[PDB]
Amino acid sequence: AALKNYYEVHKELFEGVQKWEETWRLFLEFERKASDPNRFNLLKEEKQRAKLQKMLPKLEEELKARIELWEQEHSKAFMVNGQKFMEYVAEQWEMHRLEKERAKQERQLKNKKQTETEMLYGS
Numbered sequence: 001a002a003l004k005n006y007y008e009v010h011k012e013l014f015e016g017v018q019k020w021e022e023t024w025r026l027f028l029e030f031e032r033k034a035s036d037p038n039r040f041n042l043l044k045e046e047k048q049r050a051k052l053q054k055m056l057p058k059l060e061e062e063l064k065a066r067i068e069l070w071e072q073e074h075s076k077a078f079m080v081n082g083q084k085f086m087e088y089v090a091e092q093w094e095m096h097r098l099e100k101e102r103a104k105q106e107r108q109l110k111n112k113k114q115t116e117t118e119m120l121y122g123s
Helices: 001-007 011-036 042-074 084-119
Strands: none
Touching: 001 011, 011 042, 011 084, 042 084
16 A cells, blocks of 8 residues: 555645644734734733744744655655745745734824824813
8 A cells, every 4th residue: 555655645745734724824813812902811812822833833844844855756846726835834924924014013103193193182
């Protein structure tokens, strides 16, 4: 049965792909709660977010290891719906960062003007 198991190595990468996607989605969910302005389950949410923070690097290093080996064996790039998986992962991390910054910038701008409005117009 060993030839079949060899051709399913491509499928093994995909279970890790799915687990990365699930864990990343969870991370986002505890990052939204962490950053939003009406957050003020605190220890739960922080503890749960911290666990996800720890796990993502470890999933990612494992997946890169398994992909590089696979690519070397098969002389092919490991592609996920049109993209090399670890590049897609990098891009998710940057989109998130930019989105967190864009959100911090908009709230700061909203804070600034609201202070200005209260100085002039507050009762």
